[PDB]
Amino acid sequence: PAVADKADNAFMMICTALVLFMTIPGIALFYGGLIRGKNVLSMLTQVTVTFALVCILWVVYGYSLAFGEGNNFFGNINWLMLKNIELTAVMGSIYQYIHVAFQGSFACITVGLIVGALAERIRFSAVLIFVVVWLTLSYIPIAHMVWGGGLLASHGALDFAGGTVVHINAAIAGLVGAYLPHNLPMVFTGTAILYIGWFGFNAGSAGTANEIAALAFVNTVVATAAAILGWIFGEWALRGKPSLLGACSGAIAGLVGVTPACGYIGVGGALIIGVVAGLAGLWGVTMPCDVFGVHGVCGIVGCIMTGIFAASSLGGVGFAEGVTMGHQLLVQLESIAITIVWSGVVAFIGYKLADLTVGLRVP
Amino acid sequence: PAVADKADNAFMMICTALVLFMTIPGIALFYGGLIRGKNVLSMLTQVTVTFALVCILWVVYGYSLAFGEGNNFFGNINWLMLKNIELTAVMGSIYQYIHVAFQGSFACITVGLIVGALAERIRFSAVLIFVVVWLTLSYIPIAHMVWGGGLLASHGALDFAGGTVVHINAAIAGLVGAYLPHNLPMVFTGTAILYIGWFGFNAGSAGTANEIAALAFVNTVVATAAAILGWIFGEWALRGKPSLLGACSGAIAGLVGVTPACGYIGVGGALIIGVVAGLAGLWGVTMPCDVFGVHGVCGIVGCIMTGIFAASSLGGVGFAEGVTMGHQLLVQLESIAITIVWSGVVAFIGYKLADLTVGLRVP
Amino acid sequence: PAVADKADNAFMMICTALVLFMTIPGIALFYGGLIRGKNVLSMLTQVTVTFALVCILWVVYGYSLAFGEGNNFFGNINWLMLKNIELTAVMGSIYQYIHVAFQGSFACITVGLIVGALAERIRFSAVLIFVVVWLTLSYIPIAHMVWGGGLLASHGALDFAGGTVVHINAAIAGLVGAYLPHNLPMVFTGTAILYIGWFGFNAGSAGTANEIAALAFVNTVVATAAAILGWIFGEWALRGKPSLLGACSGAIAGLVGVTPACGYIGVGGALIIGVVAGLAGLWGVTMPCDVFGVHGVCGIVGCIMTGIFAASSLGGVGFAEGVTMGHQLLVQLESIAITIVWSGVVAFIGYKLADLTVGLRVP
């Protein structure tokens, strides 16, 4: 019977603290320097309070519905308040309680990405309602489908750290919301914290301190760097000079782009994904609320590119047995489509429910 | 003969860096955004210099007097400058040098909590004198009594990470001192850093990356979140709206409240402790220098509640053999009382000694 | 055949994230609060973009030329884009991919130290050219000589974490460059981040979570603290009062001074090195661009003092067999001299090449 490895326990608990650091204060500071000064305090309050709400919903029923055994779309309710999970229960090579915390940290950053961007224009009570609906009906089922043995995973979708679950999912929610910089040193500080916490996000997704964690770690350094250069070169070409916001945006583009691919590609693939993601991101914001321009566009680019660069011939870990690059590409596309529609429909429902109960537009 | 486990060494060294992060720059930034602008530089200087002083006193004789074998109140002087501690000496499952650093990091945050709050009104030289007296005669004996096999531990007091040693101890010292916000984004940043470093503080108190570290980790996420919501709801009820300072204060209330309990309670207990701590904290600051309103009140609440929620029937790890909830509650109360009086008497002595030598009131 | 230890993998990946944190955003924030307000954005852009460039040059050929087997001055080109390094290859007790990332993080901070200081006065394109020349012809050969089995290591030079490779190397480059505070809370924040990341820098240099990592960890806490006090006392004596910039400068002086010595000396030696480094640093800045006043002076002091305090009789780990303190001192001096000249000559070449291609002085 499975025994926890202390080295993996240690690594995963530290990785969880790093992911929590991405929201508190990472994302808050990032949006904080971008949005209008008069809306900063309110946004920081919303991100903090909704972060708390997510942590609680996660432990009450979130983890159970996302990672319990159920069907292709959701888990079960046998782990309410983590009941029936023995303190010494092991999941993979770490204590299950660590997996609960690590996974909860991902739900938090996903919600932070949406709330930080929409805080300016949405009523507080309407954001709490939306978070509850969307975490429950979109984040949870998609996490289950992708990482909880659901539909997408059962079809062999490759998404190491959340191009779909986190990025495209939050990007679409923010976009439906939108449809319905005074402090650049602060934006830089938030970007830097997002970057450092992201090593916990990407490398921790291996669930162990092995060679895959090491690969994902190096690929994160490489893709982020390649994207910064890619964005900056494009900015210099289109605008005549680079800018700090451009440099920070490029870093996020590469981080988002490498998210689904990091544990599956070679360093060469990471370099190519980073450059393409940096340029696509720039193209994106050209054609806050760039809660798609970057996260959506780069998330899609990253997910598609994972279906290419995971190939052995291109330095990746290799596709599963009996899977050609063509089949994998098709599965990546179907996963992106399902995520976009699922999140969009649920977000619409969430916003509409808030709008019908308390009103969306801030009074 | 005991052998160090590298996984535990790794976890404990990273946890120590996280605790050091709580002071430098966590607490400094927290008070920095709260106190008057004209006093910020001076306060940051005092926190930095006194942090250095504590690190040195700790290695010179602090660790030895707190953790050496002595009597019920203090250790010994056989570990001056860590003499007689072989580099390869193991304490528990890690190298003793790691335990020296981890424990020293706790002395630093405790002193940071007091200095950051009083810097505005106290003379520099008077704070150095006070720190020396209080670290030596209050922090050290209380650490010894609680974690160094002294009086309180010998009576079975439950205090996982320092409700008494750190929180009530610093709260009372700050209060005796008091008796004798221009930058809210900065307060938020300090709160966020305190939060992230606190995982090292609470989970590292297990001394190993096991299921107790995992439990303390999850309980920290849960209590902090429950307290944020608790404080915010109370604020909305009493004041009509939440505020950023309220959200940050709630987070600290839950973090302080869960400190003594984190490695002993179940997640349900963490949720209850967090809510009660958030509300008590709000009540507290209602009826800087809230270096009691929160740390004192929440520290007492947390310590008392540890005597309840540690029970097996309430999802805790269970009280020691032959100990009823009633007996445990009595021991918690006696530990709180002893800490309050011990710190108060020593703080009085420290402040008076400074006042008689250089004068307390800043010139 | 060598097997990776997961505890060491975990420790080294977290230590690498901590070193990356030193540059992004550590050094950027430090210089950010020091330089003129009108130059902050541009400097943050330069540090971010050059950080990206270093990460890419490192993976493309940097790691191979620095750590591949070659001659006394450089490695080889058999590891271009990390080709021929099996994902499961082990170096020491960790996966080689982790060593690539850890070592790359050191190249980044070294370049960050120079760029952050010179950004104000140097043209963007000229800094990119200089970085490429200097990383390639100075950082790489010196890293190889000291940590890649080259000339200095072959002569028994003691430099645990980079007094020569990082500190004196960057100090001289910045000085040749120079030859050719509006936000003190921000300087403090950057200092604090540099401090916390420095535990990854120093303790991670052991390459494993053992007693040497533990020793280096404690020595870092002690030297930093001793230097803060040393600088502050000197400042109080010369200037009548301490200052925040003085406190922060002292911390960096001790951190730099203990860099080459941390894994070789006893705590007493760390205390002595910290005090001497704090005072020397103060003397230094007395007789930004203090990219020598502190890093150069303290780096030299630290390197010389490592040749003294590594001795068993003074509490150190002991010199290698057949090596007297006299011989060691001579080797330390020769290593310092070689680094100063090598970096100076290459920096001159780098700046001149930029000056002849695009012009150095910002337009």
- Provide the terminal-to-terminal Cα distance of chain B, rounded to the nearest Å: 57
Interface test with A, best of B191, B221, B233, B309 (most A CBs within 10 A): B221
Chain B contacts of C208, Cβ < 8 Å?
A: 6
Give the Cα separation of B297 and C242 in Å (integer). 35
Nearest of B197, B281, C72 to residue A20 by alpha carbon? B197
Question: Is A88 an interface residue toward B (CB < 8 Å)?
Answer: yes
Joined tokens for residue A249: 């945006």
Sign for the CA dihedral angle at C175, C177, C179, C181 comes to negative
Give the Cα separation of A244 and A246 in Å (integer). 5
Nearest of A153, A146, A113, A137 to residue A65 by alpha carbon? A137
Nearest of B339, B37, B355, B16 to residue B172 by alpha carbon? B339
Chain B contacts of C217, Cβ < 8 Å?
A: 13, 16, 97-98, 101
Q: Which residues of C245-267 are buried (b: 16+ CB within 10 A; e: fewer)?
A: bbbbbbbbbbbbbbbbbbbbbbb
Secondary element (H or E) of residue A20: helix A6-21
Interface test with C, best of B87, B96, B183, B358 (most C CBs within 10 A): B87
CB contact under 8 A, C10 and A8: yes
Q: Which amino acid appears at position B340 of this protein?
A: I
User: What φ, ψ does residue B361 adopt, rounded to 5°?
Assistant: -55, 125
Residue of B196, B211, B228 lying closest to A49 (CB–CB): B228
Distance between C133 CA and the closest CA of chain A, angstroms: 18
Q: Which amino acid appears at position B245 of this protein?
A: L
Strand partners, B272: none
Domain boundaries, chain A: 1-363
Give the Cα separation of A136 and A66 in Å (integer). 9
CB atoms within 10 A of CB C87: 17
**Which resolution, in Å, applies to this structure?**
2.1
Domain A1-363 has CATH 1.10.3430.10: yes
Give the Cα separation of B296 and B167 in Å (integer). 6
C248 CB-near residues (< 8 Å, 6+ apart): B48, C30, C187, C188, C191
CB contact under 8 A, C210 and B9: yes
CA distances from C102 to A81, A136, B61 (A): 39, 39, 35
Under 8 Å between Cβ of B144 and B70: yes
Tell me the residues of chain A between 40 and 69 that have a Cβ less than 8 Å away from chain B. Answer: 40-41, 44-45, 48-49, 51-53, 55-56, 59
Residue indicated by tokens 């607490």 = B27
Provide the pairing of β-strand C94-95 with C90-91. Answer: antiparallel
Give the Cα separation of B239 and B234 in Å (integer). 8
Question: Is B196 an interface residue toward C (CB < 8 Å)?
Answer: no
Under 8 Å between Cβ of B243 and B231: no
CA distances from B54 to B94, B115, B131, C55, C190 (A): 23, 12, 8, 38, 22
Q: Which amino acid appears at position A11 of this protein?
A: F
Question: Is B102 an interface residue toward C (CB < 8 Å)?
Answer: no
Under 8 Å between Cβ of B281 and B253: yes
Residue indicated by tokens 């060593």 = C99
Q: Is A91 helix (H, G, I), strand (E, B) or coil?
A: strand
All chains having 3 or more CB pairs closer than 8 angstroms to chain A: B, C
Chain A contacts of B220, Cβ < 8 Å?
A: none
Nearest of B143, B165, B1 to residue B75 by alpha carbon? B143
- The angle subtended at Cα C61 by Cα C60 and Cα C67, nearest 5°, is 130
User: What φ, ψ does residue B126 adopt, rounded to 5°?
Assistant: -70, -30
Chain B contacts of C224, Cβ < 8 Å?
A: 52, 55
Residue indicated by tokens 């989970």 = B203
Residue indicated by tokens 């290593």 = C335
Distance between A104 CA and the closest CA of chain B, angstroms: 9
- The angle subtended at Cα C309 by Cα C307 and Cα C313, nearest 5°, is 120
Under 8 Å between Cβ of C271 and B56: yes
CB contact under 8 A, A209 and C51: no
SS (HEC) of chain B? CCCCCHHHHHHHHHHHHHHHHHHHHHHHHHHHHHCCHHHHHHHHHHHHHHHHHHHHHHHHHHHHHHHCCCCCCCCCCCCHHHCCCCCCCEECCEEHHHHHHHHHHHHHHHHHHHHHHHCCCECHHHHHHHHHHHHHHHHHHHHHHHHCCCHHHHCCCCCCCCHHHHHHHHHHHHHHHHHCCCCHHHHHHHHHHHHHHHHHHHHHHHCCCCHHHHHHHHHHHHHHHHHHHHHHHHHHHHHCCCCHHHHHHHHHHHHHHHCCCCCCCCHHHHHHHHHHHHHHHHHHHHCCCCCCCCHHHHHHHHHHHHHHHCCHHHCCCCCCCCCCHHHHHHHHHHHHHHHHHHHHHHHHHHHHHHHHHCCCECC
Give the Cα separation of B70 and B78 in Å (integer). 10
* B49: Cα within 13 Å, side-chain hemisphere: 29
A205 is in an annotated binding site: yes
Joined tokens for residue A253: 């583009």
Q: Is A310 helix (H, G, I), strand (E, B) or coil?
A: coil
Give the Cα separation of A205 and A102 in Å (integer). 9
Give the Cα separation of A318 and A324 in Å (integer). 10
C14 CB-near residues (< 8 Å, 6+ apart): A11, A14, B10, B14, C200
Which string of DSSP letters, residue by residue, matches A156-208?
A: T---SS-IIIIIIHHHHHHHHHHH----HHHHHHHHHHHHHHHHHHHHGGGSS
Q: Which amino acid appears at position C219 of this protein?
A: N
Under 8 Å between Cβ of A240 and A217: no
SS (HEC) of chain C? CCCCCHHHHHHHHHHHHHHHHHHHHHHHHHHHHHCCHHHHHHHHHHHHHHHHHHHHHHHHHHHHHHHCCCCCCCCCCCCHHHCCCCCCCEECCEEHHHHHHHHHHHHHHHHHHHHHHHCCCECHHHHHHHHHHHHHHHHHHHHHHHHCCCHHHHCCCCCCCCHHHHHHHHHHHHHHHHHCCCCHHHHHHHHHHHHHHHHHHHHHHHCCCCHHHHHHHHHHHHHHHHHHHHHHHHHHHHHCCCCHHHHHHHHHHHHHHHCCCCCCCCHHHHHHHHHHHHHHHHHHHHCCCCCCCCHHHHHHHHHHHHHHHCCHHHCCCCCCCCCCHHHHHHHHHHHHHHHHHHHHHHHHHHHHHHHHHCCCECC
SS (HEC) of C236-247? HHHHCCCCHHHH
Q: Which amino acid appears at position C33 of this protein?
A: G
Experimental technique used to determine this entry: X-ray
Chain C contacts of A217, Cβ < 8 Å?
A: 13, 16, 97-98, 101
Residue indicated by tokens 């394109």 = C125
Nearest of B5, B213, B217 to residue A18 by alpha carbon? B217
Give the Cα separation of C196 and B105 in Å (integer). 12
Under 8 Å between Cβ of B176 and B353: no
Secondary element (H or E) of residue A296: helix A295-309
Chain A contacts of C104, Cβ < 8 Å?
A: 221
CB contact under 8 A, B10 and C7: yes
CA distances from C316 to A83, C207, C215, C307 (A): 52, 19, 10, 10
Under 8 Å between Cβ of B67 and B103: yes
Residue of A14, A232, A268 lying closest to C81 (CB–CB): A268
Q: Which residues of A207-234 are buried (b: 16+ CB within 10 A; e: fewer)?
A: bbbbbbbbbbbbbbbbbbbbbbbbbbbb
Under 8 Å between Cβ of C101 and A221: yes
